[model samples]
Target chain A: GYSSDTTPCCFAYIARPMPRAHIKEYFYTSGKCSNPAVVFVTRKNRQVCANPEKKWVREYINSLEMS
Target chain B: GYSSDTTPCCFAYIARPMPRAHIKEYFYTSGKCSNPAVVFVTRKNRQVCANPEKKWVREYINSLEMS
Candidate 1:
């Protein structure tokens, strides 16, 4: 699926690991934007941005697949 | 004068305690309904509904006030 080069994007990231139970969905944001990021949708349905380079974000993304 | 309400109104609450660090704001929803609830805006800006009577929620509300 094609998305706009600038379809809105995450600009900052959380320093803490997100709770596994609270995360409902996630997706990669554009590297096309100067800041590479990941977005986590919490149980309450808010998008939290995270550093794609962080191990915590990597773990969350992998763990989410099994959940 | 005070405020009107806390929303978007929650119909459910999560059992897991939210990380206090992620909490950016908290307020009462108890004023509106029988749910007797509070909303925690966390991860910089996500909301969770929790029982205001809960000790943990109280702690978060109290501790947050000091800062």
Candidate 2:
């Protein structure tokens, strides 16, 4: 449902590998960030960056279900 | 200005030991979480939980300055 392959400020998985295993709704900064300024709170209670493309992020999110 | 002695769900430091050491603004989920639903992003890019008491959490946030 989403793409976890988005680039970060300085790291790749810097905000990924979500803390928890469950799939949660992610947020996108429409007026704050950019086109795909998507972000989500990890299970560890951290906000990890992600792609804003709903389809891409949704795809990536779906993968989390299997993981 | 704040205390780092906040209890977590299943862990004490579960959502604490904030990612970054710098003091940033913490958010309280008034209609989302609870009264002390304080939360902030960690340097590790994680959203760690904290006490909502402005004075209490503020003290902890201030401590990050020295840390």
Candidate 3:
């Protein structure tokens, strides 16, 4: 349904609900990083539901190919 | 969850528990400029996270369209 139309470049945890803070610290305290870009930018939307207002931001992000 | 088979353009951190300071600073600091986009920039494989191999960075940047 073109999730990118709503939220582009969203590479992970697309449909997942936002976890609570106490739970969040448990996963990231090690200073580990997620490779959110593991997939091609355009392909990102396929995995997640799109948030229209937020989509604008993600679209802009997909446009970028950082060096 | 497929979790995109790994990760994608993560928004505001979905799994939760990530810190604000210890969180990646990809929000992009200004470079002698006034405006800040506030979107989290993908972390350079360098900088902090203390390890060069460490790639992602998360910054607390609220997006600004600016007038």
Candidate 4:
């Protein structure tokens, strides 16, 4: 029988910025993954990969907590 | 005929604080959920639900991005 761990963090990232308003949620890629990324889930339930190293991405991540 | 959205978001909330370092990621529960919340995933891969209305939770969420 299969246990949990079916779906984990994301493995890729996008170069564009996803509007924070459209983002319903976000996640950081697991260290186990080859890349470091932030996954932003849009209002339509779409997953948008973002490069965490980018300045805007970092700022966006910061603004989330301010909420 | 069930469709996608198999796993959307968390359905619970924890009162205690989870260290930011331990939180590898976070998410906002689906609007369809009766209660809105923020889900914090620890480095150990554990999920901790938190009430978005909580002050401490708000602060913690904000701090994640400054880094």
Candidate 5:
């Protein structure tokens, strides 16, 4: 899968060792935490972000399973 | 205005308690979380997650207001 060792922002996991964790990259601007449409991270190699409650967020995460 | 609070997921801050808080910070080998890329969170602390819909999560957190 096209992935690496990193923590996603708009995704939460209820586990032990750590109660909560969030990835705080560099958001070039500012707004509501619920705006749901912002580019929080931008790197030369790749870029990542998410859309507010766009259903797709859940859909995409759901696709990830023990394969 | 700037920010020092490490809380910026899909940008959902509909309320102080947060109707929804998505910030798992650990997407090493998974998918969906909306497939927003999967940059996840790195120890460097300069990483987050988002994508499903690209470009930007929004125009920053509204630049925070105060001064």
Candidate 6:
């Protein structure tokens, strides 16, 4: 459920076994990094992105954008 | 449960639910990158590493170093 050839964007995560919610609704992203970061999908869909200030994906995106 | 001062090494993964092996015993790694890659520890121990030829961490390290 992810794709891009040029530079589309918008992405989020934290959907492993409950309401840790931050899926950020219909997400997306691809190359041309301007604000594109913070990705970590799993459950076999398998994806990875970081350097959103590293350190545990910036403390899990500031604990889900400060709740 | 991970640390490094200058440079050490050894690392692996796949320790989520069931015997999906490839833990690679007691692992380590840091700084200098001669061959250090493949790391994924999760379940809140939260760690990440890749580029072992990308593509699903090289197909999960070639399906546990070829069974």
Q: TM-scores of the models, in the given order? A: 0.44, 0.28, 0.16, 0.45, 0.19, 0.21
Badly placed stretches (over 4 Å) of model 2 are A1-67, B1-25, B54-56, B60-67
Model 3's chain B TM-score?
Answer: 0.21
What TM-score does chain B get in every candidate?
0.74, 0.41, 0.21, 0.79, 0.21, 0.30
* Candidate 4 residue-wise lDDT, A1-67, digit = tens: 1221223334345656767788777777555444456777788987666778889888887877577
Model 4 regions lying over 4 Å from their true place: A1-67, B1-3
lDDT, residue A61, candidate 5: 38
lDDT (10s digit) by residue, model 1, range A22-65? 98898876443445668888899877778788997898888888
Candidate 4 displacement at residue B7 in angstroms:
2.7
Question: What CAPRI-style quality would you assign to candidate 4?
Answer: incorrect
- For candidate 3, give the lDDT: 0.27
Predicted complex 1: DockQ: 0.02
Best by DockQ: 5
User: Candidates sorted by TM-score, descending order?
Assistant: 4, 1, 2, 6, 5, 3
Candidate 4 colliding pairs: A62-B65, A65-B61, A65-B62, A66-B62
Mind giving the per-residue lDDT tens digits that candidate 3 earns over A1-67?
Answer: 1111112232234443222221211111111222223222232232232232344434433444231
Tell me the tens digit of each residue's lDDT in model 6 across B2-65.
2111122223333232233434322233333334555545454444444455566665556656
Error of 2 at B55 (Å): 4.8
Q: Candidate 3 falls in which docking quality class?
A: incorrect
Cα lDDT listed for each candidate: 0.65, 0.41, 0.27, 0.64, 0.30, 0.40
Q: Native contacts recovered, in order, as a fraction for each?
A: 0.00, 0.00, 0.10, 0.00, 0.10, 0.00
How much RMSD separates candidate 6 from the native structure?
Answer: 15.7
Question: What TM-score does candidate 3 reach?
Answer: 0.16
In terms of lDDT, the poorest run of 10 residues in model 5 chain B is B11-20
